Amino acid sequence: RKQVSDGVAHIHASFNNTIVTITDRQGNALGWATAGGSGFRGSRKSTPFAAQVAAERCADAVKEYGIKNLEVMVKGPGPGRESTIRALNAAGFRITNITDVTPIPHNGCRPPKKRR
Amino acid sequence: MLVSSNVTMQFGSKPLFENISVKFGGGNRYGLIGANGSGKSTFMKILGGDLEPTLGNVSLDPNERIGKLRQDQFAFEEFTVLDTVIMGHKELWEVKQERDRIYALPEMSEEDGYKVADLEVKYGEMDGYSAEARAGELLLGVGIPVEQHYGPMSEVAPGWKLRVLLAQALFADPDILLLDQPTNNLDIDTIRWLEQVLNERDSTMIIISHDRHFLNMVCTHMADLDYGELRVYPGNYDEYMTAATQARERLLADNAKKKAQIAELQSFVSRFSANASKSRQATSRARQIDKIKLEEVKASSRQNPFIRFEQDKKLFRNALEVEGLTKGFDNGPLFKNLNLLLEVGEKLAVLGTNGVGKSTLLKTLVGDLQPDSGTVKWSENARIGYYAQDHEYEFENDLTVFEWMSQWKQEGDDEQAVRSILGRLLFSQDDIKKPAKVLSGGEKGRMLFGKLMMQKPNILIMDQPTNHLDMESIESLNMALELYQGTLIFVSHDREFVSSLATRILEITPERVIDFSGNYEDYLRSK
Amino acid sequence: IKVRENEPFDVALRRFKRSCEKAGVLAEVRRREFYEKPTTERKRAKASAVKRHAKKLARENARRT
Amino acid sequence: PRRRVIGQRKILPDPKFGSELLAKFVNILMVDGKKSTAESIVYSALETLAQRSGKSELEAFEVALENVRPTVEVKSRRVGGSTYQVPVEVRPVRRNALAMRWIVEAARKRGDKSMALRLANELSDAAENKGTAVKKREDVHRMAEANKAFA
RNA sequence: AAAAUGACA
RNA sequence: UUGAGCCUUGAUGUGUAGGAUAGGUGGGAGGCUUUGAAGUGUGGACGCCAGUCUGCAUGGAGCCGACCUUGAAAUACCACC
RNA sequence: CGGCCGCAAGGUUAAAACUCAAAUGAAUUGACGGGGGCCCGCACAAGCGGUGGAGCAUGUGGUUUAAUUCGAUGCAACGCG
RNA sequence: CGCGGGGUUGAGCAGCCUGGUAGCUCGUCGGGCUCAUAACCCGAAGAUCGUCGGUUCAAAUCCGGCCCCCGCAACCA
Numbered sequence A: 001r002k003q004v005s006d007g008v009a010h011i012h013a014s015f016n017n018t019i020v021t022i023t024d025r026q027g028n029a030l031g032w033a034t035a036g037g038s039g040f041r042g043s044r045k046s047t048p049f050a051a052q053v054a055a056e057r058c059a060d061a062v063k064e065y066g067i068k069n070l071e072v073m074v075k076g077p078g079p080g081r082e083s084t085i086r087a088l089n090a091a092g093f094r095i096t097n098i099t100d101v102t103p104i105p106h107n108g109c110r111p112p113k114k115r116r
Numbered sequence B: 001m002l003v004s005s006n007v008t009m010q011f012g013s014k015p016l017f018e019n020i021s022v023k024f025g026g027g028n029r030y031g032l033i034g035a036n037g038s039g040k041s042t043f044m045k046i047l048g049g050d051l052e053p054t055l056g057n058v059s060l061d062p063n064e065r066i067g068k069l070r071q072d073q074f075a076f077e078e079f080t081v082l083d084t085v086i087m088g089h090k091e092l093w094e095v096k097q098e099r100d101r102i103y104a105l106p107e108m109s110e111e112d113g114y115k116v117a118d119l120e121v122k123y124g125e126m127d128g129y130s131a132e133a134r135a136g137e138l139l140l141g142v143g144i145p146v147e148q149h150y151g152p153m154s155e156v157a158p159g160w161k162l163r164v165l166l167a168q169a170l171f172a173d174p175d176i177l178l179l180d181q182p183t184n185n186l187d188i189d190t191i192r193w194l195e196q197v198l199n200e201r202d203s204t205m206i207i208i209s210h211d212r213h214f215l216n217m218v219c220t221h222m223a224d225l226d227y228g229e230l231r232v233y234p235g236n237y238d239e240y241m242t243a244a245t246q247a248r249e250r251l252l253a254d255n256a257k258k259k260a261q262i263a264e265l266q267s268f269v270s271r272f273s274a275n276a277s278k279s280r281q282a283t284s285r286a287r288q289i290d291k292i293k294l295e296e297v298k299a300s301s302r303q304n305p306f307i308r309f310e311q312d313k314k315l316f317r318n319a320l321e322v323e324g325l326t327k328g329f330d331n332g333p334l335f336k337n338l339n340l341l342l343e344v345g346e347k348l349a350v351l352g353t354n355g356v357g358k359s360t361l362l363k364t365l366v367g368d369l370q371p372d373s374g375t376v377k378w379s380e381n382a383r384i385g386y387y388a389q390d391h392e393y394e395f396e397n398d399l400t401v402f403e404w405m406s407q408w409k410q411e412g413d414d415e416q417a418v419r420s421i422l423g424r425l426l427f428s429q430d431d432i433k434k435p436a437k438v439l440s441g442g443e444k445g446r447m448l449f450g451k452l453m454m455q456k457p458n459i460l461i462m463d464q465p466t467n468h469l470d471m472e473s474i475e476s477l478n479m480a481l482e483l484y485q486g487t488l489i490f491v492s493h494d495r496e497f498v499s500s501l502a503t504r505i506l507e508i509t510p511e512r513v514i515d516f517s518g519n520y521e522d523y524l525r526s527k
Numbered sequence C: 001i002k003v004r005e006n007e008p009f010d011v012a013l014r015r016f017k018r019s020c021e022k023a024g025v026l027a028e029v030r031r032r033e034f035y036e037k038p039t040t041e042r043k044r045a046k047a048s049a050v051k052r053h054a055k056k057l058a059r060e061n062a063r064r065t
Numbered sequence D: 001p002r003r004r005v006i007g008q009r010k011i012l013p014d015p016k017f018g019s020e021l022l023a024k025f026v027n028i029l030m031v032d033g034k035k036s037t038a039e040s041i042v043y044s045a046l047e048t049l050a051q052r053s054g055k056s057e058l059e060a061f062e063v064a065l066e067n068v069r070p071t072v073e074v075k076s077r078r079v080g081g082s083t084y085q086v087p088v089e090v091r092p093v094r095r096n097a098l099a100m101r102w103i104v105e106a107a108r109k110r111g112d113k114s115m116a117l118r119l120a121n122e123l124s125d126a127a128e129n130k131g132t133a134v135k136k137r138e139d140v141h142r143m144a145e146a147n148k149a150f151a
Numbered sequence E: 001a002a003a004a005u006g007a008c009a
Numbered sequence F: 001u002u003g004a005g006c007c008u009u010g011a012u013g014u015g016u017a018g019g020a021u022a023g024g025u026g027g028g029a030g031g032c033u034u035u036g037a038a039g040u041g042u043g044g045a046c047g048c049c050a051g052u053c054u055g056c057a058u059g060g061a062g063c064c065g066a067c068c069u070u071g072a073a074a075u076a077c078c079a080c081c
Numbered sequence G: 001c002g003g004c005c006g007c008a009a010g011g012u013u014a015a016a017a018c019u020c021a022a023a024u025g026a027a028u029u030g031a032c033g034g035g036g037g038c039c040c041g042c043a044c045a046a047g048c049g050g051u052g053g054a055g056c057a058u059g060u061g062g063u064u065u066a067a068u069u070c071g072a073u074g075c076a077a078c079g080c081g
Numbered sequence H: 001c002g003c004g005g006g007g008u009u010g011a012g013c014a015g016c017c018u019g020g021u022a023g024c025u026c027g028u029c030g031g032g033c034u035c036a037u038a039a040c041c042c043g044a045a046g047a048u049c050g051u052c053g054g055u056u057c058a059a060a061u062c063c064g065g066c067c068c069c070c071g072c073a074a075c076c077a
Ligand SMILES: Nc1ncnc2c1ncn2[C@@H]1O[C@H](COP(=O)(O)OP(=O)(O)OP(=O)(O)O)[C@@H](O)[C@H]1O
Pocket: B011, B012, B016, B034, B035, B036, B037, B038, B039, B040, B041, B042, B043, B071, B434, B438, B439, B440, B441, B442, B443, B468
């Protein structure tokens, strides 16, 4: 309820999964939808198409709030990084702007090594 | 608040539930679970007061109008759609039927004058002037339009037969005891309509459904009736499962803690027993060994019936090969062409919504109903086993279980291969003598499975097999069907049954009959 | 990284802010530090860049084209 | 295949009607090197089909074939250890060949009588999105739109 | 993704 | 702030068949309207979304009830809940 | 082994008996790589028809017999001399 | 010859848990893949459930008797 008319859409795209959370400008989540939760278990959730389904599903479960202006914040690498922004404009949402919030540490914590 | 006070019932020669007692009352919904053949509906009848226990008392509520739903959705077929609902209320229906002996008896006496004078007054008290006024509106509210109110109950699809049988219980109803409400499987739209209806209005309810998801979405308690008694766990269903499994593995663990703490005590008593310096110590725990008294482990009533369908004669080329049916009853034909082939495939799980006509399509295919004009034909070597949606014409004529199961079979000994197929599916000597017309639900379905196993047919029509099964017989039948090497059709509404094994799924609609997308997962994905 | 261009985009086309940080640091800082693998991959990095100058200086060939 | 390219194989037009589409249809259902029977079956399966459809050849056959041809077909794309199949667009030269191949495969079934009635009943039911041959265009479409997750 | 081995003259 | 009990007041409630969103109990057919109406324009809240509803001035004093399809009779009113 | 150093792990100085006619460095020609590039063959891909299942003819392994004559036995022996 | 635990396919094991389906992992055999052996894929073979009797329609299961094996006990001034 409360009819939020101006909100945010945090896209947390990873190598494995693409997860979309729509929230108001105060950072209080309304609804969320992921790539793997749309019947894309396994390697398929790491597909750009699975993000398109995830974004369109996240348009629902928040359509009652009547959000009209979005402020998308992309984050992280992955193939479901760009195909999901274009899936928010295809549901009628008006993206006011696009921002990238990706953590680039200034040589902070030591990274892992676990691949050979 | 209705209470059971040490209730026991003995059917045959072994008690069903031994000395049960529990309190029901409040805005809660005690859905109860149990393997078919073990209490459940009998306990519901005891609570309703229709049947009395062999020991114990109903301890009935004073005048609070227990409102009930029965297991049988076909027991009402002659009373009209507007008659069943008005017959739901006893004291009204009985007085109406007695007052109907006025226009049919052309003779009236002095006592009969008083009786007709006072029965009309009782009818007025019981609102007979609005008895049919309050019924049609409820029937329209549930979703049954006017056009079929005075029509007979026979000409109704069972998904709506249940829709009317539910409304039959909706007359000033506290304490509604609903028997198996699904079966004649609802689409799923009707199921969600049910769940919203049930969980919106506030009353005390007792559900007995076998549908885990429906019970999760509806109920708050679980009055499981499994081992020998009715034990109630507060939980929807996934709390009940993790309660009744953890509390049983705990029983096994707390019993192994005794079975293994007796072992080393016995090792001591066996080693230092004749020793003069330690005999007084061995005899000190040889007597605490026998004062432990481990707690016994009962037997669960849920079992997997071993059912296996063979093949008498293998046909090769193709089986069905239907061209044009165009079957109709009252409206424009429910379907027109339905040209298709079989090719000795598997299933083609016919499905739709309630009232489309899948059951009558299967009736036309099996030949007990013939189309308006068309040809079906089967292979000259085709042997057809049939599991009807409603099977009441079969369990009749008062035969024993043994006699019913022996009336089948081709060349088999009377003592084995027919008393063995019975024991492979949950039957014993104390049960092979009870009458056929008294078994309940899943047991009748299992008897039908047994007759199919002995007839060994090539083509299994099998309308709606998963109706009254245990949820433990469902997967047994699933495995039996997927290991069966013949040809079959079936119109089950279950999701992960068609999704489990279907290959040639055929949906049916008033306009477009789709056919064979694939796994039906691809069908539901394309849709 | 931020693009406002308030009224007239209707289309992201923010490759200018996509080819600045996303490719390099993010998909590199996950592992492979080793404190001396970069110092030897760098020695090999333009042991071949100067090799192109020889190919740049290899313009004096006939090849009959 | 490897180095060169093949232009096309020149197939003579059908004797009875000047159609290059019908002539290839005869050859596809032709079996064991006997074109005498295949043209006898097709010609019989068209006259008894045209009279039902009311017109000679085009709506009898070309319409009966334009509604059975596909648009998207599926194939496998093992790249570097992958195991997924993909749907791909078919070229216009393979649509007719696929359509004719599907009809005969779905017409060699339905065993009732001689091929002349087997095929004519197959084409007439396939001319209205009803037959078992025209069914295959639906399955191949479902397998083409129910796995669009990869492109 | 998995692929180990082959007595001397 | 959130529950439960009580007192007072105000809102509150269809069919199947309709001019109409009729709780019974039946008392009754003449009250009700101007200690300003019939209907006009201004909107609160509820809303088997058609309508009730009430603050509101002006406009100034007709409407209702009966018959009526109907299981029932109509905020003609009141008491009892 | 001995000496020195060290909390310890050990470091440092430093042999012999016996045994082989070799061990090793750079480079050359081939072969090979689950190294790279280019190209070809019904090699794969797209298709059509088969073998492997059944009966029978025939050849070969074995087993048997007095003898079941000798030879061929990856591709390139097995409707072979 | 006093007390316990066991005998199921070539080997190690369930099922005996209140009676109605002879099963798991290795292994054996016949094909396939390979230059060839292993690995891998397909198909298959077996046993008197120690023996002998007993109620049961039906016993690996419940009961009685016997045989075989493996453990323990057979005490102190
Ligand atoms: N009147 C009767 N006389 C004797 N035995 C009966 C009688 N009614 C039922 N039984 C048997 O005793 C048990 C009681 O059946 P009941 O109707 O309680 O089953 P249920 O557990 O409710 O079954 P379901 O889950 O299929 O509805 C069943 O095993 C049945 O075969």
